[PDB]
From Swiss-Prot:
Mode of membrane association: Peripheral membrane protein
Cross-link annotation Glycyl lysine isopeptide (Lys-Gly) (interchain with G-Cter in ubiquitin), location: K7, K12, K28, K30, K34, K49, K64
Purpose: Exists either covalently attached to another protein, or free (unanchored). When covalently bound, it is conjugated to target proteins via an isopeptide bond either as a monomer (monoubiquitin), a polymer linked via different Lys residues of the ubiquitin (polyubiquitin chains) or a linear polymer linked via the initiator Met of the ubiquitin (linear polyubiquitin chains).
Name this protein carries in UniProt: Ubiquitin
Chain positions with (Microbial infection) ADP-ribosylthreonine modification: T67
Post-translational modification, as annotated: Phosphorylated at Ser-66 by PINK1 during mitophagy. Phosphorylated ubiquitin specifically binds and activates parkin (PRKN), triggering mitophagy. Phosphorylation does not affect E1-mediated E2 charging of ubiquitin but affects discharging of E2 enzymes to form polyubiquitin chains. It also affects deubiquitination by deubiquitinase enzymes such as USP30.
Phosphoserine sites (modified residues): S66
Residue ranges of domain Ubiquitin-like in the record: 3-76
Location(s), subcellular: Cytoplasm; Nucleus; Mitochondrion outer membrane
Positions marked as site (Interacts with activating enzyme): R55, R73
Length: 76
């Protein structure tokens, strides 16, 4: 396991403990636990990609102390 950072555009950093084989789905569930944001409303971005729920941290080459951007799904 290692840490990653999840950063909002309000300048807030969420630090998560994760494993390489964790899926984005699993990560969004953690973010829900920390910030109460429903996974269906979370958009995570890394390497300019909108990350897919079924892929893993390793799939995206996310590593120790990598940062992911977190923004909300734009409604309306
Ligand atoms: Mg775990």
């Amino acid at each position: 396991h290692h840490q990653i950072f999840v950063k909002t555009l309000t300048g807030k950093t969420i630090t998560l403990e994760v494993e390489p084989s964790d899926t984005i789905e699993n990560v969004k569930a953690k973010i829900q636990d920390k910030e109460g944001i429903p996974p269906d409303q979370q958009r995570l971005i890394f390497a300019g990609k909108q990350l897919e729920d079924g892929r893993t941290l390793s799939d995206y080459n996310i590593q120790k102390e990598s940062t992911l951007h977190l923004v909300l799904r734009l409604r309306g």
